[PDB]
Amino acid sequence: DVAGLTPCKESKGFAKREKQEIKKLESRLKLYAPDSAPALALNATIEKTKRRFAFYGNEGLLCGTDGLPHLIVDGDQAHLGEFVYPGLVFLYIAGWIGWVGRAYLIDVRTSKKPTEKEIIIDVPLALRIMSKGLTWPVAAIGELRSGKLVEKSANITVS
């Protein structure tokens, strides 16, 4: 459809990309007995290959003129499962990491030896902050609105 790519469950080049690999695996397989560890491993590999090729066609990815999936990172509603759906969860996880790290730094900074608490972590406080870091957007936006997110008296100097 879009970008001149056909869906993968109709691509006549995907069939070859499957059957050639299957036949290679079977050529490897025919060097043992059907009741030996190499044969079991190879049959498992073949079943995994079939299960993989019978999922891309059902998902809705568009293959190319060479029989290979192509990702439409465009915003297309028929393809949200390629970029934006995993991208949102990644952004969630990364904001989580950053927010809990920032909060740990903020809390440690007001102590006796803050430099000591950075080579020797204090696991109770760090764990508390990691736990509380689940609702980080509702906290980051709240700190932005309340004017608590940024400083103004930065210590940069240039003569």
């Binding site: 970008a3 690999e21 891309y56 003129t65 290979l68 003569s159």
Partner: protein, 733 residues
Amino acid sequence: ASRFPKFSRGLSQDPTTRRIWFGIATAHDFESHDDMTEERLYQKIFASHFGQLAIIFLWTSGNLFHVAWQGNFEAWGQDPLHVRPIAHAIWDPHFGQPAVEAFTRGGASGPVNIAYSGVYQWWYTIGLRTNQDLYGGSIFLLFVSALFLIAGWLHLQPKWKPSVSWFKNAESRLNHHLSGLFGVSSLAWTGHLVHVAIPESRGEHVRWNNLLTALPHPQGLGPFFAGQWNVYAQNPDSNSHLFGTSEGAGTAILTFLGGFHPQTQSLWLTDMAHHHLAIAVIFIIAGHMYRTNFGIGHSMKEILEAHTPPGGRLGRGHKGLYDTINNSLHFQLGLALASLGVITSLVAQHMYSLPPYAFLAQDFTTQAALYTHHQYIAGFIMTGAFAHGAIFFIRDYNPEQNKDNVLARMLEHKEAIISHLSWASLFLGFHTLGLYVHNDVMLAFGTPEKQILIEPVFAQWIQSAHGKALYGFDVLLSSADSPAFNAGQTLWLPGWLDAINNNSNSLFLTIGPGDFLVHHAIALGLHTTTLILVKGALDARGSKLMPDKKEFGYSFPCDGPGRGGTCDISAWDAFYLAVFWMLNTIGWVTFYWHWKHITLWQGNVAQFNESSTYLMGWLRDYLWLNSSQLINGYNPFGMNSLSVWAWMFLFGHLVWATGFMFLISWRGYWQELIETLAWAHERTPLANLVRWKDKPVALSIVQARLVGLAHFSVGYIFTYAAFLIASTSGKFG
């Protein structure tokens, strides 16, 4: 002033050998000389400009003379597809008989070189058909170079020196440049294309002896002065026109056809004439803008001053930005270099898509050379622009006059700029490398269907908006109902849509997942290079590690080992670091272009379209595969025409590797070595009768960095020029 450098005392009193080196280095820095004033400097710039023009024209005349004397231009004119253009002849007393038999190809009687500079097609297009014309051009260029030398000497005599206040007349200089040097020159070129080029393309000879006799249009100059201008676009040449003969040629001199000539696969001459006429009129009109001495015209200072938006969003606006650019030569040099380096990449990107010369795009080994040449020139120029911006900031910027204008607020928040450039470069590099390595692992484990292939939907949509009908987007120029389509339907789209929808030329080649990744690598390269250069130019006046850098100058080695270590801290060192990234970015771009076009010319575009999405494909299908005739240029079984390249190639490597010698090892080892070498020379008989004058010392620090960078760059350029010429011309696509 009593020794080799007479423009400096510090180098004169230098007993060491360094006096020689730093005499050749600081030979063109007229500003930092002894007893320099603002009126000797400008006149020296003027005379050096005249000398440079003389050298350029002498080079061009030499090219003309050597193609006329030893070349086979006349033979090439009548068969531009089954003959090779000869650059010049070779006379090497070290040659052997097989080398003479190998390099005697073409039509020449001895051994010769083959011109990969594309001058043959250029000269043939503009209407040169005989060695006599080339010789006439050569002698005329000798004459004009002699005239430029005469003027350069003249304007240094005391009676005729211009004053420093004459140079700073920016209004009149810009007025005259814009009007004359651009518009009148384009008008003269239009006249030549109309009189000599287009008729010689139609078939009829037109030279000086019959200029006033043969008119370029059956009804010349009548319709022009009567406003009936369409008469000059009545009947153009058809698809059956043979370039050179009159077999199916029209009589129109100006038109707008678009697309390529079906035979030569290049743009229409009448189109170039019309374009030059249009831009000539545009430039002539745009000339009369600034007040010279006639009452009307602008004051280019009050224009700058008048553009402070109310609300203080960017401070005092452009108030004061006139004096800085006028008095400081480095500001003008940086602006000139940047604006020149953008268009010297524009020409590279355009000349391959729309070949402007007859029978170009069929010399598969010439277009590659032209593109690579111009892109490397553009890279060096873009680096020089930032270098001179940094020099301006160091030695020409006055923080009191530039009080709160935009130029001061750029220094006011430079940390944010450097931080965001850092973030962009890190993001691009992380993700590009991640995707490339993921595809590499996926291809390594025998499962090519699990790699992240991303279709470049934005660029494909743009191409569809230009009239391409491969992706079926049908937007704004593939749509038959869009007003943009109906507007240009009568004028040029019949040719433009025809050329762009032919998948055999370089006009908007198709793109897939392999182009996406390379474009992102190019973005990463650009971003890192500008990051280095901008960091240098901004922290050239001072940083927290060294907040007096302006007092030490542009290039200084370091500030000692103290304070943790301040090696490699100057802004010249920022430029020296950025040169590497510039070379790397240009190498990526040229690799991409050359592989794409090799695969297009061979016939299997589906090898690049499928083996570039991973990184071993670049190393095996491009570098290792296309090197089979290069290294076989000579062997224990003989040698062939590529042998020279097979030498040069290896040569490159050597020089390149030698660069490392100057970049890894530093001075304190070599000086302690020279100190015992001198002992060994002094304490030997029969060899202490001789004696050195200049005390031998190791190269300086910045000098070592400079020599290392020069070796690295020369090797990088040579081992790729050799490869791109041998792998292509050895196969011709």
